[PDB]
Amino acid sequence: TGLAADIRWTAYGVPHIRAKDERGLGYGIGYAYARDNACLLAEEIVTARGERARYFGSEGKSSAELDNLPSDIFYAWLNQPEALQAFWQAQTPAVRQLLEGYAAGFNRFLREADGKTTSCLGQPWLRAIATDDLLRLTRRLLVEGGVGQFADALVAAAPPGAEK
Amino acid sequence: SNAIAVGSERSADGKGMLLANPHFPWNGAMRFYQMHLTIPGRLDVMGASLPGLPVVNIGFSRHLAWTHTVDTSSHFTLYRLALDPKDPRRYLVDGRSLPLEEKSVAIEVRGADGKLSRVEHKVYQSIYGPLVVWPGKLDWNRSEAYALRDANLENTRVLQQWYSINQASDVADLRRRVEALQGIPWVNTLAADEQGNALYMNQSVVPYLKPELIPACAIPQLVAEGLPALQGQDSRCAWSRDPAAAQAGITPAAQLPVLLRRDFVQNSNDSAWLTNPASPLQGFSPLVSQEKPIGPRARYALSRLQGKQPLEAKTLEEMVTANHVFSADQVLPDLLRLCRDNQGEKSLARACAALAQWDRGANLDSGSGFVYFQRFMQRFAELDGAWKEPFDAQRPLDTPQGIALDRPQVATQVRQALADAAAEVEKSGIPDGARWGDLQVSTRGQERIAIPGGDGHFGVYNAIQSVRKGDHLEVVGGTSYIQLVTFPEEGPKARGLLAFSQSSDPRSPHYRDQTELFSRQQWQTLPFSDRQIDADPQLQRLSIRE
C-alpha cells in the first residue's frame, strides 16, 4: 500500500509514468511492462530462479540458448539466498522502493489479466513475483560480462578421475 | 552497438546531439522496452530499459542524452591454479595447499512421466571464485585448473547507478555521478548535453592490477589470445586494493578512459583508443583499453565524422538508414577487378554479375550481391596475407585496404574463395532475382516483415544478426532501441523507434506496429513534453492505486 501511479500511453504503446515517489513510480512501471510483456518476464524469472527444468524438462533451452538443466544449476548457484539477501541489504531505500513498487504493479496486472494481451494466461509459471525475483534478474544481467559467459563451463567443471 | 555524441563545435545548431544505436537481442532478458518516468520536481527521464529494471538504461532528459555500448575492458579474470601434486581437489597459493570449497545445489527436473526428480550438482570453488572448464583449452587435470573471479558479483551499486544517471542534469553532472559510484558493469557511456558537450567514458567495473604486477601475473599464452588470465598460485596476483576505488579490487575512476570534447566522440565496441582520432586515448592497463585495429563500423563512422562540415540530425539518422556495407569499400573494388580478369570462367559468372549489379547496401531492395559478398568475406577472413595494404598502426583509419592481387598465391586463393562462396550461394534455395529483404525477416504470428540491415562484421552501421530458420533468415539481434536527440529551444527533440515493437506478445496491439515502421525506416517522434504527449491522438490514460 501507499502505491499509486498515473500512466499515459502515447502511440505504439509507450508508457509515461507519473508518481510522487519511487514506490508509486515502480508501481506504474511494473503494471505497464506486464501489460506488454508479462509472459516474457515470467519466463526470464523462471530462468533466473533456476527452475527451467522444473517447468519444461531437460530437453528445452532458455532464451539465452543454454540447456535447461545447466542453466538452472548456474542460476541456483548465482542466486543463492545468501547472495540475494546481501544484495538487497546493500540497496538504497529509493532502489528498494522502486523494486517493491515494480513487483506490486506487475502483480496487479496479473490479478486483472483476462488474456487481452497475455498469451500465457493459465500457465503455472505465470505467477505473482517478488522483489527477490527482480534481484535474480538484476544479478543475471550483472554477470553477462563475466561469469555468465562461462555458465556452461562452470557446470562442466569436475575434478579428474584415475585417467591416463 | 554504435554511439555518436556531437558537440557545439560540430553540430549544425551549436548545441549537443546524440545518436544512440545499441545492438541487442530481439527477444529474451535483454529485450529493450521504452518508457518515460516522472516524479514531478526531481525526476523526468525517457528512454528504454531491460526487462525487470525500474530505471531507464538508455535515455534523455531536459538537457542531457546518454547511451551505452559494450566495452572491450575485462570485467573478470581467470586464475590458473597450480594443483596440489598429491590432491587434484587442492591448489597451491604461495606454496601452501588449500582445499577447494564444495557448494551443492539441488534442481528439480520434470521427467518424461511428468513427475519431478531431484538432481544434485557440486560446484567447486576456490578463493577466487568457481572453477570453469573449456574442454581442450581450460581443463581440470592433475596439474592445473581455472577459476573465475567476476568483478561485478560485488557490484551492488548497479541499480543505484542507473537511477543516479536518470537524475543527471548535464554531461558534467553525469560524469560526476558515474565516477562517484562506479556501478556500471560492462558498458561504455556516451552523452551529449544542450550546452554542446560531448562525453565518452570507459567507466565501468574493471579488475585492477598495479602496472608492476602485470608482467609476472599474466598467463602470457592466454593473454596473447585475449583472455584475462592471471597466475592463481601467487598471492601477489590478487586484484590490487586502492582506497579511491568504489569497490575493493576494481580500477579507480581516475585510471579509466574519459574524453570530454566539443566536436564529437564515437564508439562501435572497439576500445577507447580512437573514440576521437584527434585525441587518441592511450597508456591504460591492458585490462582496460588497448590500441587494437578498429572494426569496420567504427571505421565507417569516423569516415563520416572527421572533417570540418557541420553535422545535422539527418546526417546521423542516415548513417543508420543508408545500410551501407562499409567492408565492401575495402574489398569489392579489387574483387570486381578479379571478376573482369576471369570473364571466361563459368563458375564465377553469376557471382561476378551479382556483385557488379550490387548497390553495396543491406537495404530491402539490395540485390543478391550482398549474399555473395557475405559468403566471400567469410572465406576471405580465413586467408593469410591477402590484404594489399595490411593494418598500419600509423594509419589506423585507412588500413587494411585492397586485395594483394599482385601475389599469384593470393590471386589464386581469392579466386578459389569466390568460387567456393558462389557454390555455397547457389547450393542454397535463393534465386538470383531475390533481394535482401526477401531473405531477412522478423516473424510476427504467421507472417513475416522484411528487415533492412546486415551483420556488424561487414561494416553495416545498422547491424542486424540473423539465422537460417525455415526458408528465411530470421532476425535474432541488432538495432533495437533507436534514439536521436537534439536540444532546440522548446525542449529535447527525440526521434527513433523500438525496432521489434513494445510487446513480445502476439496478442498485443504493439507486437509489430514499430516493426512495420522499422522495415520502412520511418523513425518517429519520442514525445517527452506534456505538450507533445497531449498532442498525440492515440493518447490513453489510466491511474492506478492499491
Ligand SMILES: CCCCCCCCCC(=O)CC(=O)O
Ligand atoms: C543489472 C545490469 C544492467 C546492465 C544494463 C546494460 C546497459 C543497457 C545498455 C546496453 O546494454 C547497450 C548495448 O546493448 O550495448
